[PDB]
Amino acid sequence: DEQYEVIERVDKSSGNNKVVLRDNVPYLRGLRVYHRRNAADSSNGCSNNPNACQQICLPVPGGMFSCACASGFKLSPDGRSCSPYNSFMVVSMLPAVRGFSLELSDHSEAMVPVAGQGRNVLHADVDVANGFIYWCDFSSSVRSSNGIRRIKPDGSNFTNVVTYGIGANGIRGVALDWAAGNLYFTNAFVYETLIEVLRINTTYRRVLLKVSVDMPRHIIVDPKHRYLFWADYGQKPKIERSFLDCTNRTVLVSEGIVTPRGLAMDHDTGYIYWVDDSLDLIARIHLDGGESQVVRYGSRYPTPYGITVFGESIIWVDRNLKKVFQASKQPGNTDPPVVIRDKINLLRDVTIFDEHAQPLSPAELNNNPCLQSNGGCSHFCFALPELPTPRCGCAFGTLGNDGKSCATSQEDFLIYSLNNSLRSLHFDPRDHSLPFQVISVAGTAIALDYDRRNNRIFFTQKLNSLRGQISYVSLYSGSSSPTVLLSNIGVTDGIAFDWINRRIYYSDFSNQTINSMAEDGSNRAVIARVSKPRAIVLDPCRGYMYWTDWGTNAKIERATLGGNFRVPIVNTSLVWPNGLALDLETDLLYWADASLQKIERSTLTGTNREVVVSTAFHSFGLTVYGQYIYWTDLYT
Amino acid sequence: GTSLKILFTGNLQHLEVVTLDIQEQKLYWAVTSRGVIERGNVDGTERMILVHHLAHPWGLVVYGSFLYYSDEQYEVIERVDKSSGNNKVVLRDNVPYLRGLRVYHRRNAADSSNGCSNNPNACQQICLPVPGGMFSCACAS
Amino acid sequence: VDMPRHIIVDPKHRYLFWADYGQKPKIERSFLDCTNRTVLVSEGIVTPRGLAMDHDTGYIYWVDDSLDLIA
Amino acid sequence: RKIYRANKYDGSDLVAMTTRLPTQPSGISTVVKTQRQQCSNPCDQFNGGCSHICAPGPNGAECQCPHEGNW
Amino acid sequence: XXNXX
Amino acid sequence: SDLLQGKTWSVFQNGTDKRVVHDSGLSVTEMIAVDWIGRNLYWTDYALETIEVSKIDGSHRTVLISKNVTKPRGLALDPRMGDNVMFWSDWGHHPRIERASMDGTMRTVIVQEKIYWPCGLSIDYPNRLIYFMDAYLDYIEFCDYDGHNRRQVIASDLVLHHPHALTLFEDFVYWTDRGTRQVMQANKWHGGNQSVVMYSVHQPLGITAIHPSRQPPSRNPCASASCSHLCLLSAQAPRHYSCACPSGWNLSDDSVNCVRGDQPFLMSVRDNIIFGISLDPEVKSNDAMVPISGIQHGYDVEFDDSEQFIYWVENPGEIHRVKTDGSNRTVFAPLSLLGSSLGLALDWVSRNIYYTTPASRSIEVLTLKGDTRYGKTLIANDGTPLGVGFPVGIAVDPARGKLYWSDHGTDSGVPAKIASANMD
Amino acid sequence: XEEXX
Amino acid sequence: XXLXXX
Numbered sequence A: 001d002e003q004y005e006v007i008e009r010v011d012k013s014s015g016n017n018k019v020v021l022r023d024n025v026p027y028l029r030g031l032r033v034y035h036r037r038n039a040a041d042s043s044n045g046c047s048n049n050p051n052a053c054q055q056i057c058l059p060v061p062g063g064m065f066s067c068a069c070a071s072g073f074k075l076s077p078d079g080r081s082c083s084p085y086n087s088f089m090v091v092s093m094l095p096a097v098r099g100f101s102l103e104l105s106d107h108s109e110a111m112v113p114v115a116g117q118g119r120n121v122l123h124a125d126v127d128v129a130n131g132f133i134y135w136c137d138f139s140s141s142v143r144s145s146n147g148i149r150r151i152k153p154d155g156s157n158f159t160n161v162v163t164y165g166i167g168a169n170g171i172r173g174v175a176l177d178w179a180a181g182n183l184y185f186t187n188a189f190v191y192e193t194l195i196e197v198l199r200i201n202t203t204y205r206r207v208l209l210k211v212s213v214d215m216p217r218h219i220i221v222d223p224k225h226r227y228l229f230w231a232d233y234g235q236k237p238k239i240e241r242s243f244l245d246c247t248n249r250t251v252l253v254s255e256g257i258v259t260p261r262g263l264a265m266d267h268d269t270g271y272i273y274w275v276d277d278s279l280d281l282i283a284r285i286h287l288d289g290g291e292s293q294v295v296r297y298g299s300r301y302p303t304p305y306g307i308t309v310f311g312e313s314i315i316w317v318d319r320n321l322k323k324v325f326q327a328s329k330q331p332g333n334t335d336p337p338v339v340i341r342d343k344i345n346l347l348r349d350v351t352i353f354d355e356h357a358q359p360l361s362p363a364e365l366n367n368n369p370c371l372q373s374n375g376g377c378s379h380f381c382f383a384l385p386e387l388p389t390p391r392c393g394c395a396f397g398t399l400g401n402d403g404k405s406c407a408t409s410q411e412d413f414l415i416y417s418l419n420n421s422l423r424s425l426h427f428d429p430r431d432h433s434l435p436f437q438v439i440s441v442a443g444t445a446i447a448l449d450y451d452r453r454n455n456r457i458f459f460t461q462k463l464n465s466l467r468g469q470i471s472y473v474s475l476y477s478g479s480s481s482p483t484v485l486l487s488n489i490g491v492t493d494g495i496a497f498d499w500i501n502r503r504i505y506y507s508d509f510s511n512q513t514i515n516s517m518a519e520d521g522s523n524r525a526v527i528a529r530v531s532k533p534r535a536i537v538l539d540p541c542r543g544y545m546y547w548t549d550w551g552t553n554a555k556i557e558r559a560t561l562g563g564n565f566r567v568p569i570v571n572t573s574l575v576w577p578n579g580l581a582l583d584l585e586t587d588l589l590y591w592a593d594a595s596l597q598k599i600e601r602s603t604l605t606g607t608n609r610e611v612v613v614s615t616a617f618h619s620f621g622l623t624v625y626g627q628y629i630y631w632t633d634l635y636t
Numbered sequence B: 001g002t003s004l005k006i007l008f009t010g011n012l013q014h015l016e017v018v019t020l021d022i023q024e025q026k027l028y029w030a031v032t033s034r035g036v037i038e039r040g041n042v043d044g045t046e047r048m049i050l051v052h053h054l055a056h057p058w059g060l061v062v063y064g065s066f067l068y069y070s071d072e073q074y075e076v077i078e079r080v081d082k083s084s085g086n087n088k089v090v091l092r093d094n095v096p097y098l099r100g101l102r103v104y105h106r107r108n109a110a111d112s113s114n115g116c117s118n119n120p121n122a123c124q125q126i127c128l129p130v131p132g133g134m135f136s137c138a139c140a141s
Numbered sequence C: 001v002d003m004p005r006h007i008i009v010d011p012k013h014r015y016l017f018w019a020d021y022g023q024k025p026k027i028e029r030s031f032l033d034c035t036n037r038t039v040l041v042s043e044g045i046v047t048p049r050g051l052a053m054d055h056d057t058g059y060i061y062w063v064d065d066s067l068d069l070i071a
Numbered sequence D: 001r002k003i004y005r006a007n008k009y010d011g012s013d014l015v016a017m018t019t020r021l022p023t024q025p026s027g028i029s030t031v032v033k034t035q036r037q038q039c040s041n042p043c044d045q046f047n048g049g050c051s052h053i054c055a056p057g058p059n060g061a062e063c064q065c066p067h068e069g070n071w
Numbered sequence E: 001x002x003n004x005x
Numbered sequence F: 001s002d003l004l005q006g007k008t009w010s011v012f013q014n015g016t017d018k019r020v021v022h023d024s025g026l027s028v029t030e031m032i033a034v035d036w037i038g039r040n041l042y043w044t045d046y047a048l049e050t051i052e053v054s055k056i057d058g059s060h061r062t063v064l065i066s067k068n069v070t071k072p073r074g075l076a077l078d079p080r081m082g083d084n085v086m087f088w089s090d091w092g093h094h095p096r097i098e099r100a101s102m103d104g105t106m107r108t109v110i111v112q113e114k115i116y117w118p119c120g121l122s123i124d125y126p127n128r129l130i131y132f133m134d135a136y137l138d139y140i141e142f143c144d145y146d147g148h149n150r151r152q153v154i155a156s157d158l159v160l161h162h163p164h165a166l167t168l169f170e171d172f173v174y175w176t177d178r179g180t181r182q183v184m185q186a187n188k189w190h191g192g193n194q195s196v197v198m199y200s201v202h203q204p205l206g207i208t209a210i211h212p213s214r215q216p217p218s219r220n221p222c223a224s225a226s227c228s229h230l231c232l233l234s235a236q237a238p239r240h241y242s243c244a245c246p247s248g249w250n251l252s253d254d255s256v257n258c259v260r261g262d263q264p265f266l267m268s269v270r271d272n273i274i275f276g277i278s279l280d281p282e283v284k285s286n287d288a289m290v291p292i293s294g295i296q297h298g299y300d301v302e303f304d305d306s307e308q309f310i311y312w313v314e315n316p317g318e319i320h321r322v323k324t325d326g327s328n329r330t331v332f333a334p335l336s337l338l339g340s341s342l343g344l345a346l347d348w349v350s351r352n353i354y355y356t357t358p359a360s361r362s363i364e365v366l367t368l369k370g371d372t373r374y375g376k377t378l379i380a381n382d383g384t385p386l387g388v389g390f391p392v393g394i395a396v397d398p399a400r401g402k403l404y405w406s407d408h409g410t411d412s413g414v415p416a417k418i419a420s421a422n423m424d
Numbered sequence G: 001x002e003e004x005x
Numbered sequence H: 001x002x003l004x005x006x
């Protein structure tokens, strides 16, 4: 007795003859008697039949025994062996991912539960053919705990699938195209949302769509009809469809829908099932977008968070009721929903891991062209609703004239340094194809310029507080590691290439000077001594160069490429002139003051100075192409 | 405070508010552990289940011909007939954090007078009514 | 060395009693000015935490939660 | 924050006269009723001949000047 | 914040 | 001894060959005293309130002194065959310094006057004087082996604040002060030549002087002994030794052999320790088995007669095992990833163990027969009342293939009940 | 952001 | 400092 602080002994036939063994004992708990229990006087089926079952032997009344298997294994029909589960539901919650048999009777864990530190699972999807379960973790604080991970149903071969470039709001939905091996997921930022494709076991990844007003959250894919569906619960709630490349957008449900956070596909009747926790109903709609049919509705369905379809029944989870339900998928049915598991906390979603749910014969998938070998396509194949030839998507570069290969873009485009890599960006805002695959370099790349004749980018490279160097890399077909042009420099913040005299100019911030060299790394020269220089531009046809001084006495100054005639072009109202560019087509000079937060234009020699854009927050680099200016912002 | 009595005991884990129909002299209560609303006479007889398959009943009131209940899960205020609990109706749904219920209505103290009302200023501090129209005076702590 | 904890006073017999429960548990008795100390009980006492007296019989009542005793 | 004592010759019998006082005790003196050692003060006769202030030195009265002014 | 790469 | 690990270690004086001596069943080891003649190891445990002895390699552990031992701190030995005596200090109610021959037969009290919080002990071997210290009265003293000729080496001196442990070498005494956080030096006869040896950031608890003079050689009376298990030096009889055996062994009538006690005993689980206590209410020793210290949140225990293993669960979701001797304390297998387990039941006939996890609301089975651990969930929380609501306890009947468990209720689901099921 | 619990 | 080492 834990309050009496006592161990007491009484007769087994009556509470009489009480005896104290110990008293004044704090924190008493369980009792048990260590004695000579004999393994031979008591016998059962398991003792009489050793090593009969492969993994577990469990005795049953009448001296018989029944074999059992570990979590994620089930008895073979022989009654002695174990095999991995083939048909089970994948229930996802914030703390863990768990698997239950699709027959209510078997209570066994049909899958090794994914749990432990760092699990905040939002959604799950399955790859039945390869035997993988994909899920997305989300953390609003730790950036490491955001991404997509996969694991075998038996708990082996854990792998991080997506870990780079996840937005603040994290991955909000994942859908695997088991036919093409594409993994569609939704990447959500603070004020905008991306849909992206990753081809499994490849580095290929591209964005299909970027929206600010809409917010796709939960996404499903159907390789049988070659459509992609997502649920929006933003300011204009809807259920939305496209082709497998996110081109042909159309809205299946637009009214009588508030916060749909779940979608499911029937694959046999072509209906779209969704759960709506603000109208407390489960409804279905056909692919062609007819009239919505109510499957379940009323007060008894307060928060259906996720849904799936298996055979003749729908399965959904409820956050409030903490139960997983099963009921007839046909509308107008009035049978009470059958409970599979209850008192499960933080239910998020439910998915079916079955061969029937992911067919692979061309007879089932309506001859999906990605089955054979990625449609013969180099990067991504996207099957369309009626064309028997796949559309070829390109992860980086431009699609070849053959219609299936990819090569480096021959168009004009932006390039920018992003820490330890050189990135590329088309001028077209709605073109999401990278002109070339990202180049990885050592240290951090600070400033860069393109040599048109040899098709190279020269770029500065910071190594530490005092160490800097200049390297270059070729954009010709194939590849080449970055090659150092001149080492043993301080930190360099600026670089400019002369295409007429074939020389490289740069600004040594540590040494407070403007330097020059030949394009082959020889013939180093000093052009000027300047406190804290950032940017350089060249006009070799007029033999003039301009560069920016920031800090004390900040000014924009001009000299010859020789560096004799130093004159200050602009010195009124400047603090941090980080950016400088020249518009050769119009003969105008553009600079960015990162402290006064503005971009300005003037003539050469600083006549008719005016603001191009105010509140450019914290510019570093700037460039002019066509009728637009582009700048990098260090604050946003 | 006198004449303590036990009316109903048994399957009453996670009890909720008791409420009273004064006209019919019947008690109504919810049992969260069983998700039911039960009814019984004030003398401790005719205990029976009225409404079932609730999640977490929290507020409960009987007025006119009807019983009103707030189910804290189900996030709903519902109304049902006090006789055998048919003709279910939703007053409001998607209400987070529902709690107790009560019906504001005019009550006539003249038509339900007791000992304390018939004898004002009889007790110095506190007057408490007693069955049979009597009253027992009381003092503060 | 001693530690009086719970003290009671008796104006009828003009004594102070206190419990100790320290390193040498005891119940002591003294005059109303703490002069003329005496030990009433030193054996079978470990943690006396409260004293009491009946004025009409002159018995000292104490409790001890270490022996589970009321004596 | 206590007052201690010890034997003046060898520091034996070191005991604390007070419990831990709430503030730090500073400054101490005896009050003694018996007159201490007395000697004839030369400043008691015609101010020791000094003009202003004087005190009995080792040999005789030492004159002294006030704190204000240069003397 | 402070103006460096 | 490490207080946080609950282990006794040893190392060479050059810092090489760090190896464990006792890995389990220590809670708060106050002082260690090795017997360099009889090759025994003596220590005092504050939490268990016992004086324990072992072989110097840790092998055979038994409880030596248990009757009136409240808060044992100090411990000193005189293994010379002439003396063969032990000393210890107890700072419970009625504090005292006690003298007993090793094997704990000739027990006597030597110092009980002007004592309050006695702490630390050391022997002057040449003079046969036991030095002792006090933290409340703040003195250092010494006396004969019988407690006579008690004398003060420091007393009525402010330099002692809270001395803990004590050491002698030639004519110096050294001690550790937990108040000043220093170790001091003074002349062991008049305290007169005081200095700080060193300043410590943390409280200095233990002290010893490494020197051959601190362990005088003596003819070993137990060298010719044929006692099985422990042989302890004794001060009584010309033989000057006595045979003893660890916890859970008889002494044979032929007083050199011991037989394992096959009699039952009650395992008393407590929040942070598991005790094996005798079924006889008169025997209050709490030494039927080596106690399992370092339990986080103890609720239930389970044992295997074969291999003499004791099983219990821990907070991180795992199951631990140890011998009744302490010899193989290891984490047995991972139990469940979905929270901690509460109940335990072992199928000794089929070598299975059953456990309940209220976090996952399931009853699970784990095998302990083969090299590979296989785990399965048997009953889970379905909608029906027949399932598992919130399992507390579990009992098994291997001979009839029945499983019994006590269950709390769930809202709108399972009622609070006693349930039965097949072991599959 | 919806669920960071 | 209280005597109990723990």
Ligand SMILES: *[C@@H]1O[C@H](CO)[C@@H](O)[C@H](O[C@@H]2O[C@H](CO)[C@@H](O[C@@H]3O[C@H](CO[C@H]4O[C@H](CO)[C@@H](O)[C@H](O)[C@@H]4O)[C@@H](O)[C@H](O[C@H]4O[C@H](CO)[C@@H](O)[C@H](O)[C@@H]4O)[C@@H]3O)[C@H](O)[C@H]2NC(C)=O)[C@H]1NC(C)=O
Residues within 6 Å of the ligand: A127, A129, A130, A131, A132, A157, A181, A200, A201
């Ligand atoms: C992407 O990379 C990941 C990185 O780990 C890879 O996992 C994955 O590659 C592999 O995908 C294939 C898909 O077929 C998997 O192979 C399959 O393994 C099945 C399991 O095999 C085990 O169990 C069977 C049971 O009988 C046993 O015989 C095996 O010895 C083994 O223990 C297997 O059943 C299946 O066989 C089918 O296909 C075979 C093709 O040759 C036929 O011979 C056979 O008759 C049957 O039709 C197949 O071999 C593989 O497991 C998987 N890799 C790993 C390590 O799991 C990559 N793929 C993608 C895009 O996800």
Ligand SMILES: *[C@@H]1O[C@H](CO)[C@@H](O[C@@H]2O[C@H](CO)[C@@H](O[C@@H]3O[C@H](CO[C@H]4O[C@H](CO)[C@@H](O)[C@H](O)[C@@H]4O)[C@@H](O)[C@H](O[C@H]4O[C@H](CO)[C@@H](O)[C@H](O)[C@@H]4O)[C@@H]3O)[C@H](O)[C@H]2NC(C)=O)[C@H](O)[C@H]1NC(C)=O
Residues within 6 Å of the ligand: F249, F250, F259, F260, F261, F262, F263, F264, F278, F279, F280, F281
């Ligand atoms: C090492 O030393 C220990 C301690 O001395 C020995 O333990 C004792 O072993 C004997 C023999 O097994 C035990 O005797 C048996 O006790 C059973 C139940 O306990 C009774 O007695 C205890 C002790 O007085 C009481 O606390 C309790 O209330 C019971 O009254 C009895 O059921 C047994 O009776 C059966 O056998 C006897 C003959 O022995 C018959 O006369 C009976 O009809 C009946 O068939 C028996 O009396 C004794 O209880 C143990 N004591 C303890 C402390 O457990 C170890 O045996 C010893 N090791 C070895 C191997 O010798």
Ligand SMILES: *[C@@H]1O[C@H](CO)[C@@H](O[C@@H]2O[C@H](CO)[C@@H](O[C@@H]3O[C@H](CO)[C@@H](O)[C@H](O)[C@@H]3O)[C@H](O)[C@H]2NC(C)=O)[C@H](O)[C@H]1NC(C)=O
Residues within 6 Å of the ligand: F012, F013, F014, F016
């Ligand atoms: C630290 O000190 C220890 C103890 O001195 C060293 O370990 C070993 O000590 C023994 C002492 O006898 C060394 O001698 C060997 O003794 C055995 C006894 O059977 C004998 O068979 C060997 O031929 C040998 O004489 C022993 O060499 C030594 N072990 C090693 C590894 O050398 C230990 O070496 C010391 N470590 C350091 C860092 O000095």
Ligand SMILES: *[C@@H]1O[C@H](CO)[C@@H](O[C@@H]2O[C@H](CO)[C@@H](O)[C@H](O)[C@H]2NC(C)=O)[C@H](O)[C@H]1NC(C)=O
Residues within 6 Å of the ligand: A419, A420, A442, A443, A444
């Ligand atoms: C940015 O570039 C650096 C290298 O210039 C990458 O390398 C890590 O730099 C951090 C310090 O910022 C070190 O602690 C790591 O050990 C470096 N190694 C790696 C591979 O992590 C860094 O990863 C880059 N960061 C981002 C987010 O682009």
Ligand SMILES: *[C@@H]1O[C@H](CO)[C@@H](O[C@@H]2O[C@H](CO)[C@@H](O)[C@H](O)[C@H]2NC(C)=O)[C@H](O)[C@H]1NC(C)=O
Residues within 6 Å of the ligand: A568, A569, A570, A571, A572
């Ligand atoms: C800022 O630039 C102006 C030129 O636009 C500088 O003005 C000239 O300063 C030189 C100094 O030797 C004079 O000889 C010229 O006569 C000035 N010209 C004009 C038009 O003012 C000016 O010194 C620069 N410095 C600042 C901070 O005002």
Ligand SMILES: *[C@@H]1O[C@H](CO)[C@@H](O[C@@H]2O[C@H](CO)[C@@H](O)[C@H](O)[C@H]2NC(C)=O)[C@H](O)[C@H]1NC(C)=O
Residues within 6 Å of the ligand: F067, F068, F107
């Ligand atoms: C353990 O403690 C008990 C209780 O103090 C001791 O029993 C007392 O012993 C004295 C002799 O020293 C007797 O005069 C008392 O009458 C005893 N009191 C009781 C209540 O029994 C006992 O001697 C101690 N035993 C050991 C092993 O030291």
Ligand SMILES: *[C@@H]1O[C@H](CO)[C@@H](O[C@@H]2O[C@H](CO)[C@@H](O)[C@H](O)[C@H]2NC(C)=O)[C@H](O)[C@H]1NC(C)=O
Residues within 6 Å of the ligand: F187, F190, F191, F192, F193
């Ligand atoms: C401390 O050490 C000093 C020497 O450093 C010892 O000093 C002598 O002690 C005797 C006996 O007390 C005194 O009578 C002498 O006068 C001391 N000699 C000198 C030169 O001072 C001393 O014994 C040590 N212990 C004490 C108690 O001081």
Ligand SMILES: *[C@@H]1O[C@H](CO)[C@@H](O[C@@H]2O[C@H](CO)[C@@H](O)[C@H](O)[C@H]2NC(C)=O)[C@H](O)[C@H]1NC(C)=O
Residues within 6 Å of the ligand: F327, F328
């Ligand atoms: C219990 O512990 C002992 C001691 O560690 C283990 O015995 C050792 O086992 C290893 C591995 O086979 C051997 O290399 C050692 O030589 C053994 N030492 C001794 C002293 O025998 C024993 O295997 C453990 N038993 C179990 C089942 O836990």
Ligand SMILES: *[C@@H]1O[C@H](CO)[C@@H](O)[C@H](O)[C@H]1NC(C)=O
Residues within 6 Å of the ligand: A156, A157
């Ligand atoms: C998958 O797991 C198996 C077993 O642990 C291992 O041998 C194999 O190398 C793993 N494969 C990969 C790609 O990690």
Ligand SMILES: *[C@@H]1O[C@H](CO)[C@@H](O)[C@H](O)[C@H]1NC(C)=O
Residues within 6 Å of the ligand: A248, A250
């Ligand atoms: C999809 O775009 C095609 C052109 O590719 C257009 O003809 C068609 O009308 C669009 N789909 C629907 C349903 O409007």
Ligand SMILES: *[C@@H]1O[C@H](CO)[C@@H](O)[C@H](O)[C@H]1NC(C)=O
Residues within 6 Å of the ligand: A488, A489, A490, A510, A511
């Ligand atoms: C900086 O300038 C000095 C000349 O003053 C030159 O020798 C050196 O190579 C340059 N680089 C660095 C970082 O010291």
Ligand SMILES: *[C@@H]1O[C@H](CO)[C@@H](O)[C@H](O)[C@H]1NC(C)=O
Residues within 6 Å of the ligand: C036
């Ligand atoms: C009181 O004190 C005196 C002096 O110590 C002593 O002799 C006497 O016995 C004490 N008790 C009484 C009741 O006087």
Ligand SMILES: [Ca+2]
Residues within 6 Å of the ligand: A277, A278, A279, A280, A301, A302, A303, B075, B094
């Ligand atoms: Ca709702």
Ligand SMILES: [Ca+2]
Residues within 6 Å of the ligand: F135, F136, F137, F138, F160, F161, F162
């Ligand atoms: Ca002290």
Ligand code: NI
Residues within 6 Å of the ligand: B016, B032, B056, B057, B058
């Ligand atoms: Ni409630």
